[PDB]
Design a protein around this nucleic acid. Structure first.
Ligand SMILES: [Ca+2]
Ligand SMILES: [Ca+2]
Length: 197
DNA sequence: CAACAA
Protein backbone atom coordinates (compact mmCIF):
# COMPACT_ATOMS: atom_id res chain seq x y z
CA UNK A 1 0.00 0.00 0.00
CA UNK A 2 1.06 3.62 -0.57
CA UNK A 3 1.40 5.73 2.61
CA UNK A 4 -0.71 8.78 3.43
CA UNK A 5 0.35 12.10 4.94
CA UNK A 6 -1.28 11.93 8.38
CA UNK A 7 -0.08 8.31 8.60
CA UNK A 8 3.57 9.07 7.78
CA UNK A 9 3.70 11.74 10.50
CA UNK A 10 1.91 9.93 13.33
CA UNK A 11 4.33 7.00 12.90
CA UNK A 12 7.44 9.22 12.93
CA UNK A 13 6.75 11.27 16.06
CA UNK A 14 9.60 11.92 18.45
CA UNK A 15 9.87 10.04 21.74
CA UNK A 16 8.82 13.23 23.55
CA UNK A 17 5.71 13.56 21.37
CA UNK A 18 4.42 10.05 22.12
CA UNK A 19 5.12 10.52 25.84
CA UNK A 20 3.15 13.75 26.23
CA UNK A 21 0.23 12.33 24.22
CA UNK A 22 -0.19 8.92 25.87
CA UNK A 23 0.31 10.54 29.30
CA UNK A 24 -2.43 13.09 28.61
CA UNK A 25 -4.55 10.27 27.20
CA UNK A 26 -4.27 8.04 30.28
CA UNK A 27 -5.02 11.06 32.48
CA UNK A 28 -8.28 11.41 30.53
CA UNK A 29 -8.93 7.67 30.84
CA UNK A 30 -8.31 8.05 34.58
CA UNK A 31 -10.67 10.96 35.20
CA UNK A 32 -13.39 9.68 32.88
CA UNK A 33 -12.89 6.01 31.93
CA UNK A 34 -12.29 3.76 28.92
CA UNK A 35 -16.00 3.86 28.06
CA UNK A 36 -16.32 7.62 27.73
CA UNK A 37 -12.81 8.65 26.65
CA UNK A 38 -13.47 6.82 23.42
CA UNK A 39 -16.77 8.72 23.39
CA UNK A 40 -14.91 12.00 23.97
CA UNK A 41 -12.55 11.43 21.03
CA UNK A 42 -15.57 10.38 18.95
CA UNK A 43 -17.20 13.74 19.67
CA UNK A 44 -13.86 15.51 19.16
CA UNK A 45 -13.37 13.91 15.74
CA UNK A 46 -16.97 14.60 14.75
CA UNK A 47 -16.88 18.38 15.21
CA UNK A 48 -13.69 18.66 13.18
CA UNK A 49 -15.30 16.91 10.21
CA UNK A 50 -18.57 18.85 10.48
CA UNK A 51 -16.71 22.18 10.61
CA UNK A 52 -14.92 21.34 7.48
CA UNK A 53 -18.08 20.00 5.87
CA UNK A 54 -19.92 23.17 6.88
CA UNK A 55 -17.47 25.58 5.24
CA UNK A 56 -17.44 23.38 2.12
CA UNK A 57 -21.04 24.56 1.69
CA UNK A 58 -19.91 28.18 2.23
CA UNK A 59 -17.15 28.22 -0.38
CA UNK A 60 -19.50 26.08 -2.54
CA UNK A 61 -27.18 28.09 16.58
CA UNK A 62 -27.17 24.38 15.74
CA UNK A 63 -28.29 21.61 18.13
CA UNK A 64 -24.83 21.26 19.66
CA UNK A 65 -23.06 24.35 20.97
CA UNK A 66 -20.20 23.69 18.55
CA UNK A 67 -21.58 26.56 16.43
CA UNK A 68 -18.73 28.79 17.64
CA UNK A 69 -16.32 27.24 15.12
CA UNK A 70 -17.73 29.02 12.08
CA UNK A 71 -18.37 32.31 13.87
CA UNK A 72 -14.73 32.01 14.98
CA UNK A 73 -13.68 31.83 11.32
CA UNK A 74 -15.84 34.53 9.68
CA UNK A 75 -13.06 37.11 10.06
CA UNK A 76 -10.94 34.61 8.09
CA UNK A 77 -13.48 34.01 5.34
CA UNK A 78 -13.70 37.77 4.79
CA UNK A 79 -10.22 37.41 3.23
CA UNK A 80 -10.73 34.09 1.40
CA UNK A 81 -11.37 34.48 -2.34
CA UNK A 82 -10.96 32.77 -5.70
CA UNK A 83 -11.62 29.23 -4.50
CA UNK A 84 -10.07 26.71 -6.86
CA UNK A 85 -10.39 23.39 -5.11
CA UNK A 86 -11.90 21.70 -2.09
CA UNK A 87 -11.16 18.31 -0.57
CA UNK A 88 -8.82 17.04 -3.19
CA UNK A 89 -6.98 13.77 -3.27
CA UNK A 90 -3.37 14.39 -4.11
CA UNK A 91 -0.91 12.02 -5.79
CA UNK A 92 2.87 12.36 -5.65
CA UNK A 93 4.46 10.62 -8.63
CA UNK A 94 8.02 10.85 -7.28
CA UNK A 95 8.10 10.37 -3.50
CA UNK A 96 5.04 8.07 -3.58
CA UNK A 97 2.52 9.26 -0.98
CA UNK A 98 -1.10 10.37 -0.99
CA UNK A 99 -3.16 12.94 0.87
CA UNK A 100 -6.53 14.71 1.01
CA UNK A 101 -6.23 18.47 1.54
CA UNK A 102 -9.15 20.58 2.74
CA UNK A 103 -9.25 23.22 0.01
CA UNK A 104 -7.18 25.46 -2.26
CA UNK A 105 -8.12 29.13 -2.43
CA UNK A 106 -6.73 32.66 -2.34
CA UNK A 107 -6.33 34.16 1.14
CA UNK A 108 -5.48 37.87 1.13
CA UNK A 109 -4.93 37.58 -2.62
CA UNK A 110 -2.25 34.88 -2.29
CA UNK A 111 -3.12 31.40 -3.54
CA UNK A 112 -2.42 28.85 -0.81
CA UNK A 113 -3.43 25.44 0.52
CA UNK A 114 -5.81 25.97 3.44
CA UNK A 115 -6.26 23.39 6.21
CA UNK A 116 -9.04 24.06 8.72
CA UNK A 117 -8.51 22.96 12.32
CA UNK A 118 -10.75 22.87 15.37
CA UNK A 119 -9.15 23.19 18.80
CA UNK A 120 -10.27 23.79 22.37
CA UNK A 121 -6.88 25.24 23.36
CA UNK A 122 -5.76 28.48 21.67
CA UNK A 123 -2.83 28.21 19.24
CA UNK A 124 -1.35 31.71 18.85
CA UNK A 125 1.94 30.28 17.55
CA UNK A 126 2.55 27.91 14.66
CA UNK A 127 4.70 25.90 17.08
CA UNK A 128 1.47 25.21 18.99
CA UNK A 129 0.05 23.42 15.92
CA UNK A 130 2.67 20.63 16.25
CA UNK A 131 3.00 18.81 12.87
CA UNK A 132 0.28 20.85 11.13
CA UNK A 133 2.72 22.76 8.83
CA UNK A 134 4.37 19.52 7.70
CA UNK A 135 0.88 18.21 6.92
CA UNK A 136 0.21 21.30 4.80
CA UNK A 137 3.52 21.34 2.92
CA UNK A 138 3.10 17.62 2.29
CA UNK A 139 -0.24 18.36 0.62
CA UNK A 140 1.19 21.11 -1.59
CA UNK A 141 4.22 19.08 -2.66
CA UNK A 142 1.90 16.20 -3.54
CA UNK A 143 -0.65 18.29 -5.46
CA UNK A 144 2.19 20.08 -7.24
CA UNK A 145 3.87 16.79 -8.25
CA UNK A 146 0.57 15.50 -9.59
CA UNK A 147 -0.96 14.54 -12.93
CA UNK A 148 -4.49 15.68 -12.07
CA UNK A 149 -4.11 19.40 -11.35
CA UNK A 150 -3.61 22.43 -13.58
CA UNK A 151 -1.84 24.81 -11.19
CA UNK A 152 0.97 24.83 -8.64
CA UNK A 153 0.79 26.59 -5.28
CA UNK A 154 3.62 27.89 -3.11
CA UNK A 155 2.08 29.12 0.16
CA UNK A 156 0.04 27.39 2.85
CA UNK A 157 -2.39 28.42 5.54
CA UNK A 158 -3.40 26.79 8.82
CA UNK A 159 -6.48 28.18 10.55
CA UNK A 160 -7.39 27.14 14.09
CA UNK A 161 -11.08 27.65 14.85
CA UNK A 162 -12.28 27.64 18.45
CA UNK A 163 -15.52 26.26 19.84
CA UNK A 164 -16.25 29.35 21.97
CA UNK A 165 -16.36 31.74 18.99
CA UNK A 166 -13.02 33.38 19.78
CA UNK A 167 -11.17 34.95 16.82
CA UNK A 168 -9.57 32.05 14.97
CA UNK A 169 -5.81 32.08 14.47
CA UNK A 170 -4.63 32.19 10.83
CA UNK A 171 -1.09 30.81 10.48
CA UNK A 172 -0.04 31.90 7.00
CA UNK A 173 3.17 30.41 5.57
CA UNK A 174 4.96 32.18 2.71
CA UNK A 175 7.06 30.51 0.02
CA UNK A 176 10.30 30.37 2.01
CA UNK A 177 8.80 29.09 5.27
CA UNK A 178 7.02 26.34 3.32
CA UNK A 179 10.37 25.37 1.78
CA UNK A 180 12.00 24.82 5.18
CA UNK A 181 9.05 22.87 6.59
CA UNK A 182 9.06 20.86 3.36
CA UNK A 183 12.57 19.48 3.88
CA UNK A 184 11.60 18.76 7.50
CA UNK A 185 8.67 16.84 6.03
CA UNK A 186 11.02 15.33 3.43
CA UNK A 187 12.98 13.86 6.34
CA UNK A 188 9.86 12.60 8.17
CA UNK A 189 8.86 10.84 4.95
CA UNK A 190 12.18 8.97 4.91
CA UNK A 191 12.24 7.76 8.53
CA UNK A 192 8.90 6.15 7.70
CA UNK A 193 10.11 4.44 4.52
CA UNK A 194 13.34 3.47 6.30
CA UNK A 195 11.15 1.98 9.05
CA UNK A 196 9.51 -0.26 6.42
CA UNK A 197 12.68 -1.60 4.77
C1' DC B 1 -8.02 9.37 4.46
C1' DA B 2 -9.32 11.90 8.10
C1' DA B 3 -11.10 14.18 12.25
C1' DC B 4 -7.74 15.82 17.68
C1' DA B 5 -5.11 15.08 21.53
C1' DA B 6 0.46 17.35 23.51
CA1 LIG C 1 -8.37 20.07 8.23
CA1 LIG D 1 -0.45 19.12 -11.19
Amino acid sequence: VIPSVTRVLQQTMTKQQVFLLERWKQRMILELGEDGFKEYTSNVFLQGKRFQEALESILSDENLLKSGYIESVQHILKDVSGVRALESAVQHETLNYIGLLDCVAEYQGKLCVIDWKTSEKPKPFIQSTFDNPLQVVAYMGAMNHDTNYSFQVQCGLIVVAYKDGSPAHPHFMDAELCSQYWTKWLLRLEEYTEKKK
